[PDB]
């Protein structure tokens, strides 16, 4: 009976909660208390990247740590030479409501998507001099909110149809559809080894998925409301989530629980972007109150602030060699920090 | 000071900036609008008329170009999204106006429309965004009230103690009952509007039938007023 199934679900959920309660023998604070506080970090706007007409929702660093793709709601992707602030490419988009972008690890492609429900893929390195649309991937019902290239032929898209998908770029069709969320999936972070990935939705729950077997492997809870950003710790055995309940939270896949929560009483805006440094000792979060906060992830004190934008910080990305951090906001500007 | 190839790269960037300026004039001269409504709301007929008179399977957003008096307008309605709305609505915090279409002749889904309007008005990102609400399907409301079968007092009890405002302007010559009813619906929406505006955004009411050909002119007039208010605030005149 339906009552029987519901009772079984409650029983298994209680069993999971009990196992999680048993496994938590010490807080990360209790063990992280020994260590010295990172100290205040002062990061300064080394470069300011002007040229976007409207607000920015997305940015992705290149694996060469110098090029930079940025997505604005005016209908542009701009590829910056971050060292010299030159504009390398200016890619006009077919749908202006872009709200994600990715930069292929090889550097031959970038992706973008938004309210059009499409993940368009752009070919940067053509024999002709221009940047052309390589493929348009269709099949999601809700909007696209994040995309991440696994290699030059496989991309993973999260959507607001409660579904993340894995695509074959050569043969447009989907290869795996990841179902199990009950709200809009907002962010997405591929693991370093690219065999797994996590996605946070609008149901306050995040899930570690399996790219090859196609099935959700874990589910994590603890947030009070919908999750806006997610990112892997450089280890690959953890991830941090920022949500509209004004908190960041650090889950761990092996313990399958929550480790620490990054919150302050005076901060009531929702986190919009989360990214780590190389060591993982600094958790950088972009908030709605126009400032990105820097959190010492091991002990959850506010390490620093990066307050320079004139409107909310929508995107935030740390480069692969850890040299710089870039922040894009709704004031049409990108800021590179050291 | 820097090499030949770097000079040529800087020249390329300067030409890109020149193109971005040329795109900025056309971006700043076109006005973006968001069209919202329900299934019964006649927003599809409105968009069809605005498309025809003036100027792809799971696509998540549609676009309509029209221009009135040489001023260009963009109108977007969502096509394939889910019922949840709190996240994709944030993308429209800088549109000129939100065109909110509501069916006035239902009486059963009208409280749902009022709730949707109150959510839109009070949204933390849709503040400073004025709403041009089209109280649609006026003739259905008229024939419904004359027929007398369905009682508006049972869904809305305060209508019994409601009297037509003195500012009312029933133009064609209409039964006072329908004028009273339609101004009651308008006053519900306008109490929601004036509860918490704070003078930063306005609500422009319009009694509309989807057949009407003057919707684009209404949008143009209201957008002119909105931009005028913004220019007042920006040019220090208040």
């Amino acid at each position: 009976e339906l009552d029987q199934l519901r009772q079984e679900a409650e029983q298994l959920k209680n069993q999971i909660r009990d196992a999680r309660k048993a496994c938590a023998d010490a807080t990360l604070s209790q063990i992280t208390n020994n260590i010295d506080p990172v100290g205040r970090i002062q990061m300064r706007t080394r470069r300011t990247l002007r040229g976007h007409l409207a607000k920015i929702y997305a940015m992705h660093w290149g694996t060469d740590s110098r090029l930079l793709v940025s997505a604005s709601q005016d209908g542009k992707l701009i590829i910056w030479d971050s060292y010299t602030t030159n504009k390398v490419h200016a890619i006009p988009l077919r749908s202006s409501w872009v709200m994600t972008c990715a930069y292929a690890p090889s550097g031959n492609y970038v992706a973008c998507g938004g309210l059009d429900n499409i993940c368009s893929i752009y070919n940067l390195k053509t024999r002709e001099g221009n940047v052309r649309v390589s493929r348009e991937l269709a099949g999601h019902t809700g909007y696209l909110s994040c995309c991440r290239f696994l290699d030059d032929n496989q991309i993973v898209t999260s959507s607001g149809d409660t579904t993340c998908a894995l695509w074959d770029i050569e043969t447009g069709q989907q290869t795996t559809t990841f179902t199990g969320h009950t709200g809009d999936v907002m962010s997405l972070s591929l693991a370093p080894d690219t065999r797994l990935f996590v996605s946070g939705a609008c149901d306050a729950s995040a899930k570690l998925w399996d790219v090859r077997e196609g099935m959700c492997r874990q589910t994590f809870t603890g947030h009070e409301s919908d999750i806006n950003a997610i990112c892997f710790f450089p280890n690959g055995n953890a991830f941090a989530t920022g949500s509209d309940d004004a908190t960041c939270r650090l889950f761990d896949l092996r313990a399958d629980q929550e480790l620490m929560t990054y919150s302050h009483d005076n901060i009531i805006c929702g986190i919009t972007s989360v990214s780590f440094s190389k060591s993982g000792r600094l958790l950088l979060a972009g908030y709605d109150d126009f400032n990105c906060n820097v959190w010492d992830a091991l002990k959850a004190d506010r390490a620093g602030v990066l307050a320079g934008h004139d409107n909310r910080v929508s995107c935030l990305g740390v480069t692969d060699d850890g040299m710089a951090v870039a922040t894009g906001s709704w004031d049409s500007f990108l800021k590179i920090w050291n | 000071t820097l090499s030949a190839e770097d000079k040529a790269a800087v020249e390329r960037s300067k030409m890109i900036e020149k193109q971005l300026q040329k795109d900025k004039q056309v971006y700043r001269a076109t006005h973006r609008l968001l069209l919202l409504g329900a299934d019964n709301s006649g927003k599809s007929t409105i968009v069809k008329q605005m498309r025809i008179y003036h100027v792809v399977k799971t696509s998540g957003i549609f676009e309509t170009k029209f221009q009135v008096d040489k001023v260009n307008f963009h109108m977007f309605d969502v096509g394939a999204q889910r019922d949840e709305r709190r996240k994709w609505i944030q993308c429209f915090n800088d549109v000129t106006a939100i065109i909110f279409v509501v069916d006035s002749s239902d009486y059963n889904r009208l409280q749902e429309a009022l709730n949707d309007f109150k959510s839109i008005w009070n949204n933390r990102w849709l503040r400073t965004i004025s709403v041009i609400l089209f109280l649609n399907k006026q003739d259905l409301l008229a024939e419904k009230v004359l027929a007398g079968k369905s009682k508006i007092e049972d869904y809305f009890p305060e209508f019994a103690r409601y009297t037509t405002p003195e500012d009312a302007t029933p133009e064609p010559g209409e039964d006072p009952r329908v004028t009273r009813a339609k101004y009651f619906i308008r006053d519900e929406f306008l109490r929601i509007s004036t509860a918490s505006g704070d003078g930063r955004h306005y609500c422009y009411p319009h009694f509309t039938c989807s057949v009407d050909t003057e919707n684009a002119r209404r949008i143009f007039n209201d957008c002119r007023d909105i931009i005028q208010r913004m220019h007042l605030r920006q040019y220090e005149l208040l």
Partner: nanobody, 123 residues
Framework: QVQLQESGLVQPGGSLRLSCAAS????????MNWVRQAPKGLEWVSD????????SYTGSVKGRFTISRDNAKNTLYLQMNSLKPDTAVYYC????????????????????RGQGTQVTVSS
């Protein structure tokens, strides 16, 4: 996790108190609500602000129901009075985001809603 377990057949004109036990979040920061579904889609019945100061009602429930929140014990409950032949399932709906006047609480399985309690009124 977020859990909103609602609790609470009555002949016409009777009374019933529908209480909702909320756990998982700071219960006092959110605008709570009441949602019903007659055998028809979902409809919104009564809201309440964070401190209980602001209360709104659907017209058909005006004067007959009363929405109250005890933020100390984490419960949104309404006292149904003179329940007319109303025969539906009642959910407790929590607004998606804290500290916000707007709420977008939905047939497409809005996450922060309970399983529901069936109140039946017939002779």
């Amino acid at each position: 996790q977020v859990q909103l377990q609602e609790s609470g057949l009555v002949q016409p004109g009777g009374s019933l108190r529908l209480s909702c036990a909320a756990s998982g979040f700071t219960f006092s920061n959110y605008k709570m609500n009441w949602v019903r579904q007659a055998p028809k889609g979902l409809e919104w019945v009564s809201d309440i602000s964070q401190s209980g100061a602001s209360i709104s009602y659907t017209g058909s429930v005006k004067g007959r129901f009363t929405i109250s929140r005890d933020n100390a014990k984490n419960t949104l409950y309404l006292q149904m009075n003179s329940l007319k032949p109303d025969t539906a399932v009642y959910y407790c709906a929590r607004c998606p985001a804290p500290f916000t006047r707007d709420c977008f609480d939905t047939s497409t399985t809005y996450a922060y809603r309970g399983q529901g309690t069936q109140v039946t009124v017939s002779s």
